[PDB]
Curated annotation (Swiss-Prot):
PANTHER family: ALPHA-TOCOPHEROL TRANSFER PROTEIN (PTHR10174:SF225), ALPHA-TOCOPHEROL TRANSFER PROTEIN-RELATED (PTHR10174). It comes from Homo sapiens. Keywords: Cytoplasm, Disease variant, Lipid-binding, Transport. GO terms for cellular component: cytosol; late endosome. InterPro entries: CRAL-TRIO_dom (IPR001251), CRAL-TRIO_dom_sf (IPR036865), CRAL/TRIO_N_dom (IPR011074), CRAL/TRIO_N_dom_sf (IPR036273). One of its GO terms (molecular function) is lipid transfer activity. This is Alpha-tocopherol transfer protein. Binds alpha-tocopherol, enhances its transfer between separate membranes, and stimulates its release from liver cells. Binds both phosphatidylinositol 3,4-bisphosphate and phosphatidylinositol 4,5-bisphosphate; the resulting conformation change is important for the release of the bound alpha-tocopherol. A 1,2-diacyl-sn-glycero-3-phospho-(1D-myo-inositol-3,4-bisphosphate) binds at residues 161, 166-168, 193, 197. Monomer and homotetramer. Phosphatidylinositol 4,5-bisphosphate binding induces the formation of homotetramers. Phosphatidylinositol 3,4-bisphosphate is less efficient in inducing tetramerization. One of its GO terms (biological process) is response to toxic substance. (+)-alpha-tocopherol binds at residue 163. The lineage of its organism: Eukaryota, Metazoa, Chordata, Craniata, Vertebrata. Changing residue 222 to R: In AVED; mild and slowly progressive form of the disease. It is linked to Ataxia with vitamin E deficiency: An autosomal recessive disease characterized by undetectable or markedly reduced plasma levels of vitamin E, spinocerebellar degeneration, ataxia, areflexia and proprioception loss.
Length: 251
């Protein structure tokens, strides 16, 4: 593929972390595909990926699911079986199922990093990106307390140029008034392209959400074929089964 050997050589010359994550063709292609084979942009992304991991060890060091298995079992997250019409993988996060008295913002962030490291293995997802739906129903001030300026900047970094996944859309639904101050904290760090891709649906989201995700949503959101619990169980099992791959990319 165009630029693969050049990207490997740069990484080697720059002395990027020896291991884990050998510089296989499959690994490097994630970076080239995320940036449409633009070598310089792929290289910037690769360096940023390593930078972010080194700067956020609380989240990145151990990707084994044992630290967040309770959060998965609580029903916080699921991945749809089907892709959207543009081929993006679709992720669902439910704030009401995150108990901030038990899990920190770092733990919750780790869930997304685990899912992201798993789904990036799919070439269709490297090509078509992802969309994430956050159901903010139940957002509390106790969740907001966990979103410090540091965490806000880390969120903005992975959405923009620190992880090899194209964020094609972020859909916030059921956002309560009190969430505005939290989003305002993240906003200053986002690129214009990402801000343009964050949709605020509000409390009457059904029609608008279905327009973006026809025929693939769970029953809870207007879908008609399966439930959120079905997808949360299916994804949690897959994460559990992937514990050793996650171990191999852990440190
Ligand atoms: C690679 C990748 C990661 C790692 C990722 C996300 C996406 C789309 C990615 O492609 C979205 C979620 C996020 C940024 C982790 C968020 C963790 C926090 C603690 C969740 C609750 C608070 C948020 C204020 C809720 C809305 C977030 C959106 C503005 C993304 O992690």
């Amino acid at each position: 593929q165009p630029g693969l050997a050049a990207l490997r050589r740069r990484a080697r010359e720059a002395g990027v972390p020896l291991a884990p994550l050998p510089l296989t063709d499959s690994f490097l292609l994630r970076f080239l595909r995320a940036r449409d084979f633009d070598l310089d942009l792929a290289w910037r992304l690769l360096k940023n990926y390593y930078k972010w991991r080194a700067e956020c060890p609380e989240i990145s060091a151990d990707l084994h699911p044992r630290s967040i298995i309770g959060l998965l079992k609580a029903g916080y997250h699921g991945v749809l079986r089907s892709r959207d019409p543009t081929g993006s993988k679709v992720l669902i996060y439910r704030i009401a199922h995150w108990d901030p008295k038990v899990f920190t913002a770092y733990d919750v962030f780790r869930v997304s990093l685990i899912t992201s490291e798993l789904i990036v293995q799919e070439v269709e997802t490297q090509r078509n990106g992802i969309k994430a739906i956050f159901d903010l129903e139940g957002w509390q001030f106790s969740h907001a307390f966990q979103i410090t300026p540091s965490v806000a900047k880390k969120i903005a970094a992975v959405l923009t140029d620190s992880f090899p996944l194209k964020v094609r859309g972020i859909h916030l639904i059921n956002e309560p008034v009190i969430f505005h101050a939290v989003f305002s904290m993240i906003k200053p760090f986002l690129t214009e392209k990402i801000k343009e891709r964050i949709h605020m649906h509000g409390n009457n989201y059904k029609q608008s959400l279905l327009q973006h995700f026809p025929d693939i949503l769970p029953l809870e959101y207007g879908g008609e074929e399966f439930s959120m619990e079905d997808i949360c169980q299916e994804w949690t099992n897959f994460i559990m089964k992937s514990e050793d791959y996650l171990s191999s990319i852990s440190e």
